[PDB]
Design a protein around this ligand. Structure first.
Ligand SMILES: [Zn+2]
Ligand SMILES: [Zn+2]
Lengths: 94, 665, 294, 318
DNA sequence: TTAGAGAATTGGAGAGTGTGTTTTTTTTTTTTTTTTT
DNA sequence: CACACACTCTCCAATTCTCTAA
């Protein structure tokens, strides 16, 4: 009957288990900065982790595109706001 | 209807052959009744194009070549008939037909515009009639090498010879006619292409934009030929005497001319700051360095050689990428894995006026010949030293009265003329020391500051951006002038005091909207803001409070979006941006305001070997900034691990968490 | 942690492949070949003690020449590298692409780490190549079969003829019809990875981007038809022949009627049933893609 | 009323190198000065050639490559040599400005209106000569000289050089439509009232045709290294350079090496594709392959292999 | 001033229509011209 | 004939624009 609805980023995907919680678990281990490298290699070490994780969550879209989409969703969704403030409230509590 | 069109063409073609001919005894002879044929053709232009808004007569007079085969030869012979007599020092009859030939030249050369109020027939013919106007410009500039421009100045001399007081209005009209003729011959400019979009694109785009007639080159129409024909026909000497003799009727046509042939010259070519072979060599070494980077990204064997990589990733799973270059370079592999994605997010992207510094590309430059470049710079230097000061003083009065009547075209050709001349004359007085700055001292006078500021304010309030853009340009130049005269040394303080509350809020709002508009708009906002902050810093209401008015996410957004275009920016504009990021990082300690991901990608894309040139002065301070940025980012992340998500998203406004996010207790 | 790079289908690590081959491409004394075959009575100080590939590379730099010949048996002669010989026979296209780049890394290390005074861009601009030879036992052209697809093979034959040289595109060059902007677009498996839209975000027009053939960049391809050598034929019938594609610097190595020995990867490709469709014949055209000729 | 998009030519990107070549070539053509004939003297030989052209109304300019080679450390001759096909529109646009300066009578074909004149820039006297066997795709778009012997010459035929069309749907006119290797009609009508993208007719009065000839040449029978088969090349001659050679003759040609597409696969108006592997994945090909010949496009031709009146002969001799 | 609800325009799914495709080509007889028979 | 490609037509929903109250 219909055309298939478009797959699109939303908190029900972006908040889900391999998702922001996967970043909070793995990134502090996998992303390493030093003045012993040039700035361009440090930037590449940051960007690798997020590029592979963005490919795992939403393989449809390029990395710059995924960033523009995350900006619009974090600006609009109240549940995503509630999750982010909840993370900061934990660090303030400690 | 079509019978009416073919009868109109037949009637005008029979009038066109009635004017005269080569005589063949070749020396062009006036037809008997030529004056009546010229007056009848003027009647045809009026009684059709005014009365019915058609453009059909103005179209078909080009078909039968009336301008290039009758009006031009008639004016050029009459010029010779008066030049010879002046060197010897019914001519009262031939005056009337020379005047009426100039009248028809001005009508045929009049600028074309299309609007909501435009006729269904005018919008049909518009794109075509621009081609005939291009042929008219080529023919006017090249037919006996601008002897017709010499005939035009002669018809002006005929009324300059009788006194400023003892003249009649029917002669001041002739002055305005001759000035309008020159502004037209200048401002014939190649047309826009236009497509109907009711029907979607085929599998190729618009395969040619080339809006030129079959025997016109782009160079036959360029300012090089304009400057050449003006210098050879002593036009500049006429304009210079005219703009000095102002001690009201004509000031606005005269400003229009100075706008129409200063508009697209970026001034910096007028100042260099085997030489052309050395210049060619340096550019070939930059293209060689770029091709060296492309060669370092290219296959060392053929296209079909077929090597295939698998990338293991966390969750102990595979991707695959083709090509020998990807096997060895992990960064190329991941770049290729993103390049192949068949999705793109849909982008969003953005009037009767000429193409100008508002609209032309940031990289655009007009290539003067060496004699043309000296003939131009000497003309404008004489004009600045003679007449700019009195001309600006006159038109700023005429438009401080009468503001509400200025339709957008007058408003631009005033604002841009003011900005371009003040920028050129600041730059001349930078390199030359015998240039006075104070020669343009009129620009800082209170009446002109008030006009420029009022005009920008009303354009912003009425949301007329083309005028706000022109306002922002002129205000940026007035600020450059103020800063220069302050460094040289009370009129500075009067203007500097005059913006303390409301213009501050306006100029702070300008970059917040900037991210919605063209590269030229963002460029102007950034140049203005750099100049403002440099002024307010030098003067110290409260620098910390006023800059905190600028330190907000929407401004950082338009700065990132201007910096995304960097491959087509110049080192000056990149140095302005990174000075502002240095100001935000060091002077404010705002640093969380910049940690968003868009900046991190953009630093990598320009710090890359494929990005900025390694020998560029521009790369050196980007590399320095990046080292400080990554140090503060590492510190922030080690102290607060949540910043990995906070860096991915825009900032929060729930009060306690929003403060903690921004500053780390 | 590190996203490991693996030759597809193999469980072979490209880092281990590279970091072995580098440590063969220097430290290999020719002494080790005269241990491999023995003849070990014959060992001569002047040749055999010299670092063989160091001398080869210093010659390449000074001659300004881009191609290193490599007798594959040297890989077996050196303890660390015996398994790389087996990888070179089994996975040629990737293993040769690793060796090609390792040469270029070595050429740079041999001047910058050695801090010797020479022009760097003169080396950075070159496409270096390995040309492996002596790869294994030669075999009859008639003894080829589909078990051999995508492997190095060693053939002997008589050249029947060469085509005139064929331009094979390596970089497509595109221009925006609306805005005059231009792009170098990388060719990949013979497909042009065409852009959908103008790359200038100030333009971004779809479909208006177009190809300019004489501003593209090309490799040299040549077909040689090679006949089976009369020593190898079964005497009941005619010799066979095989087409071979010779590439880049190897184009016009051979005259017609040369006897040659070739090392190449044995290839198969599908071919179109009809030139207007992607319908393919179920049995594939085969050729050798040569990497050395003697 | 319409829905329409205006589309403005001023926002086109400029080739900064192309324009720096135009200026260096413009300065060379006027100033070059040097002469040794009769005595040590200044002549401005390319201005002297333009003033010669002004008399006869000839539409070609010959340029000695050694004059470019010595000018301004030879960076101009290096750029023109290595990237000739990129720079040629800039060379022609540079020459037009110099001809406009010193002989504006030539600037048209020179009553009805007389057209734009097209100028064949004819480089000659290169430092080095290549054989047909020395040709390699690495030199595409670069200025060579080639030595060979002619086996055949085609008819002299007209190329459609700049096309002009009228829209059958609205009767508008499109002009200056540049032609690639295929025939090419406009994709969009210039009238914003018109939804047309096809259905075009050529105006044969307003469109402009170059003269053109294919000549087939081969490697010289004394040069072939072992008496093997003679390798051949297709050379294209245009403008004044047509019929300047003959079969069995020995010639030196100079011009660009070019890649010619196999145009049937490129979707040519009203023709079927024909039936070695090409390249694919392009809007105009869809599923097809595009394949390529090497050809040469010669700007200058010279052979290396009765007017019985004293009134002509005694003026023919020096 | 932020943020959320309602209105307009664009993208592309996918349905629909229309076109081209097999394909060969040496062999065997008859003739008319050069030259080597 | 029938089955792929080339190309146009049409509808539907997805995204962004614009206005209002919290
Ligand atoms: Zn573009
Ligand atoms: Zn039409």
């Amino acid at each position: 009957r219909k055309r298939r609805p478009q797959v699109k980023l939303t908190a029900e995907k972006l908040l889900s288990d391999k998702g922001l919680p996967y970043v909070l678990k793995n990134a502090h281990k996998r992303i390493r900065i030093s003045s012993k490298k040039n700035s361009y290699d440090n930037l590449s070490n940051i960007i690798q982790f997020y590029q592979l994780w963005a490919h795992e969550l939403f393989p449809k879209a390029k990395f710059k595109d995924f960033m523009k989409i995350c900006q619009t969703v974090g600006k609009t969704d109240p549940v995503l706001r509630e999750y982010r403030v909840s993370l900061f409230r934990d660090e303030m509590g400690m | 209807a079509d019978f009416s069109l073919t009868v109109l063409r037949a009637r005008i073609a029979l009038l066109a052959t009635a004017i005269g001919g080569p005589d063949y005894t070749p020396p062009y002879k006036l037809g008997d009744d030529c004056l009546a044929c010229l007056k009848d053709l003027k009647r045809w232009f009026k009684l059709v194009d005014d009365q019915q808004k058609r453009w059909d007569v103005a179209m078909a007079v080009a078909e039968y070549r009336i301008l290039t085969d009758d009006l031009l030869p008639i004016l050029i012979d009459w010029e010779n008939k008066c030049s010879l007599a002046a060197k010897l020092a019914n001519k009262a009859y031939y005056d009337k037909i020379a005047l009426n030939c100039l009248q028809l030249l001005v009508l045929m050369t009049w600028p074309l515009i299309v609007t909501e109020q435009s006729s269904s027939n005018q919008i049909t013919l518009y794109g075509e009639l621009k081609k005939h106007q291009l042929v008219y410009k080529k023919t006017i500039l090249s037919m006996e090498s601008g002897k017709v421009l010499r005939a035009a100045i002669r018809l002006a001399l005929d009324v300059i010879k009788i006194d400023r007081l003892s003249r009649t209005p029917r002669d001041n009209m002739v002055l305005k006619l001759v000035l309008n003729f020159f502004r037209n011959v200048i401002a014939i400019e190649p047309g826009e292409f236009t497509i109907n979009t009711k029907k979607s694109m085929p599998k190729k785009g618009i395969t040619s934009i080339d809006t030129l007639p079959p025997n016109v080159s782009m160079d036959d129409i360029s300012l090089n030929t304009v400057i050449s024909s003006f210098h050879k026909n002593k036009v500049f000497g006429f304009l210079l005497t005219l703009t000095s003799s102002l001690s009201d009727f004509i000031n606005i046509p005269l400003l229009e001319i100075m706008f129409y042939f200063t508009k697209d010259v970026n001034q910096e070519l007028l100042f260099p700051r085997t030489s052309a072979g050395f210049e060619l060599s340096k550019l070939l070494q930059k293209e060689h360095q770029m091709r060296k980077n492309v060669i370092k990204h290219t296959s060392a064997r053929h296209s079909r050689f077929g090597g295939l990589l698998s990338i293991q990733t966390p969750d102990k799973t595979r991707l695959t990428v083709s090509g020998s270059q990807a096997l060895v370079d992990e960064k190329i592999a991941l770049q290729k894995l993103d390049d192949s994605k068949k999705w793109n997010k849909r982008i969003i992207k953005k009037e009767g006026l000429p193409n100008s510094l508002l609209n032309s590309q940031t990289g655009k430059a007009i290539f003067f010949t060496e004699s043309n470049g000296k003939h131009f710079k000497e003309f404008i230097n004489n004009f600045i030293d003679s007449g700019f000061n009195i001309l600006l003083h006159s038109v700023t009065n005429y438009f401080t009265t009468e503001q509400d009547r200025m339709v957008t075209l007058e408003q631009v050709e005033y604002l841009l003329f003011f900005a371009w001349f003040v920028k050129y004359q600041l730059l001349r007085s930078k390199i030359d020391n015998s240039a006075d700055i104070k020669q343009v001292s009129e620009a800082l006078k209170e009446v002109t500051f008030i006009l420029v500021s009022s005009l920008l304010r009303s354009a912003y309030d009425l949301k007329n951006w083309t005028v706000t853009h022109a306002g922002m340009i002129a205000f940026n130049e007035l600020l450059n002038l103020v800063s220069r005269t302050k460094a040289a040394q009370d009129i500075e303080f009067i203007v500097s005091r005059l913006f303390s509350d409301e213009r501050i809020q306006l100029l702070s709002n300008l970059p917040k909207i900037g991210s919605k508009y063209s590269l030229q708009f963002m460029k102007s906002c950034i140049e203005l803001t750099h100049s403002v902050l440099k002024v307010l810093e030098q003067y110290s209401v409260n620098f910390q409070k006023v800059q905190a008015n600028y330190m907000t996410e929407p401004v950082i957004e338009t700065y990132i979006n201007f910096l995304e275009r960097f491959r087509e920016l110049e080192d000056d504009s990149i140095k302005k941006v990174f000075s502002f990021f240095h100001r935000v990082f060091v002077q404010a300690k705002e640093q969380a305001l910049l940690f968003r991901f868009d900046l991190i990608i953009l630093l990598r894309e320009m710090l890359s070997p494929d990005g900025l040139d390694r020998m560029s002065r521009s790369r050196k301070y980007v590399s320095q900034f990046s080292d400080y940025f990554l140090a503060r980012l590492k510190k922030r992340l080690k102290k607060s691990p949540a910043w990995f998500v906070g860096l991915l998203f825009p900032p929060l406004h729930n009060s306690e968490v929003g403060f903690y996010q921004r500053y780390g207790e | 942690s590190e996203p490991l790079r693996i030759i597809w289908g193999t469980n072979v690590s490209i880092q281990e492949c590279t970091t072995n081959f580098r440590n063969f491409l220097m430290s290999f004394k020719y002494k080790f070949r005269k241990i491999l075959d023995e003849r070990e009575e014959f060992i001569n100080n002047t040749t055999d003690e010299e670092l063989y590939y160091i001398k080869q590379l210093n010659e390449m730099r000074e001659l300004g020449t881009s191609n290193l010949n490599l007798d594959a048996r040297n890989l077996l002669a050196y303890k660390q590298t015996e398994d790389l010989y087996h990888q070179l026979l089994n996975y040629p296209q990737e293993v040769i692409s690793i060796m090609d780049q390792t040469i270029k890394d070595c050429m740079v290390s041999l001047i910058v780490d050695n801090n010797l005074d020479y022009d760097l861009d003169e080396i950075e601009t070159k496409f270096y190549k390995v040309r492996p030879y002596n790869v294994g036992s030669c075999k009859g052209m008639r003894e080829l079969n589909p078990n051999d697809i995508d492997k190095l093979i060693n053939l002997k034959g008589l050249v029947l003829r060469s085509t005139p040289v064929i331009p094979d595109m390596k970089v497509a060059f595109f221009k925006c019809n609306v805005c005059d902007h231009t792009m170098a677009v990388e060719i990949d498996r013979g497909v042009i990875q065409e852009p959908a839209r103008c790359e200038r975000i100030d333009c971004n027009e779809p479909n208006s981007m177009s190809l300019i053939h004489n501003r593209c960049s090309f490799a040299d391809k040549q077909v040689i038809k090679l006949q089976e050598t009369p020593d190898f034929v079964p005497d009941g019938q005619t010799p066979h022949s095989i087409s071979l594609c010779v590439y880049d610097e190897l184009v016009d190595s051979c005259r017609a009627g040369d006897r040659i020995e070739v090392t190449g990867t044995f290839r198969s490709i599908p071919i179109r049933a009809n030139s207007r469709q992607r319908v393919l014949k179920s049995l594939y055209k085969t050729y050798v893609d040569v990497v050395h000729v003697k | 009323s319409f829905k329409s998009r205006a589309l403005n030519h001023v926002k086109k990107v400029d080739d900064v190198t192309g324009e720096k070549v135009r200026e260096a070539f413009e300065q060379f053509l006027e100033d070059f000065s040097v002469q040794s004939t009769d005595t040590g003297e200044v002549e401005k030989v390319y201005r002297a050639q333009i003033e010669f052209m002004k008399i006869y109304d000839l539409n070609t300019i010959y340029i000695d490559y050694q004059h470019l080679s010595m000018r301004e450390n030879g960076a101009l001759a290096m750029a023109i040599s290595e990237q000739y096909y990129r720079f040629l529109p800039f060379l022609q646009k540079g020459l037009r400005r110099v001809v406009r300066k010193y002989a504006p009578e030539l600037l048209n074909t020179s009553s009805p209106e007389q057209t734009e004149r097209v100028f064949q820039i004819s480089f000659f006297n290169l430092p080095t000569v290549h054989r047909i066997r020395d040709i390699r795709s690495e030199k595409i778009g670069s200025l060579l000289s080639i030595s060979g012997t002619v086996t055949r010459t085609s008819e002299v035929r007209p190329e459609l050089y700049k096309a002009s069309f009228t829209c059958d749907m609205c009767r508008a006119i499109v002009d200056n439509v540049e032609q690639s290797f295929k025939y090419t009609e406009p994709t969009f009508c210039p009238n914003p009232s018109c939804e047309n993208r096809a259905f075009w007719t050529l105006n044969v009065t307003r469109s402009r045709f170059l003269d053109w000839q294919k000549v087939r040449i081969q490697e010289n029978a004394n040069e072939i290294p072992t008496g093997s088969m003679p390798r051949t090349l297709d050379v294209i001659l245009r403008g004044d350079s047509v019929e300047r050679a003959k079969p069995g003759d020995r010639c030196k040609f100079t011009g660009v090496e070019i890649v010619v597409p196999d145009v049937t696969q490129l979707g040519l108006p009203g023709v079927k594709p024909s039936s070695n592997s090409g390249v694919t994945g392009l809007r105009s090909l869809g599923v097809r392959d595009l394949t390529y010949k090497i050809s040469f496009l010669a700007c200058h031709v010279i052979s290396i292999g009765n007017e019985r009146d004293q009134e002509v002969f005694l003026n023919s001799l020096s």
